[PDB]
Amino acid sequence: GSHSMRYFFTSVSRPGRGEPRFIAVGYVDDTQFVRFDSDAASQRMEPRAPWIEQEGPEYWDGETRKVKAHSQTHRVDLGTLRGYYNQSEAGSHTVQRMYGCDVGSDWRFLRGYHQYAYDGKDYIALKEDLRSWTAADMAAQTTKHKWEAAHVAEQLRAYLEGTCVEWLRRYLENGKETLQRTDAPKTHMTHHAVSDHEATLRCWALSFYPAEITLTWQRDGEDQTQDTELVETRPAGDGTFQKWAAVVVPSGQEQRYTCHVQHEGLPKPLTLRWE
């Protein structure tokens, strides 16, 4: 199928308490492989996947150098943006940055992206055409025009269509045992009595990869989305994911309900019936 590489940068200012916190993580699809903590001891980009650990000294020195430059750029942005919005010098603020690229089933470039946020909302984004910008507000305009004259889009486009996809492909090759795998959900239902006339039916999906999954309940066919408690898909901590969906059912009607499961790793969708 298709694949993505995404880098996530978060910078949080800490007035009086020295320089901002800077954290970087990299993912291929749903698997983290990179990560950097300005508060960490190493001061180096560090491996977070087995298949990236033996990449070599040049790689780690190189990502370390570049990631440090990201740290300094964001540190200055924190001040610049503070000035844009005339905000107090005592308050903590957040800059977030996400960029990456996708490749199709054939591993050819599919799309690139570069999003930027200040204090939890959109600030400026690279448009799909990789040539223009979408500015969220007044302050974004100043940055939008600045990047236009600085031909920043061109720089990013060259990265997104070149280095980004080139190394995504390299990683998919290197970590092919991990990244090019599907782990179908191991599923099951549990039954708990709420009262003497009600019961909780919970539908579980465990140990699956990638994260994408659909868990739904039906009663006699009718989707019970509005009566279903559906938790967010969560990491198990070993690279796999978990999810459940539960309904509260009148005791005695258990046979009317079915849990339906869809995942990329399933030959066909699953239908679980308490019986």
Binding site: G62, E63, K66, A69, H70, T73, K146, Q155
Partner: peptide
């Protein structure tokens, strides 16, 4: 691999 160059908001 992360982006090489420069910038400045």
């Amino acid at each position: 691999k992360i982006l090489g160059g420069v910038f400045x908001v």
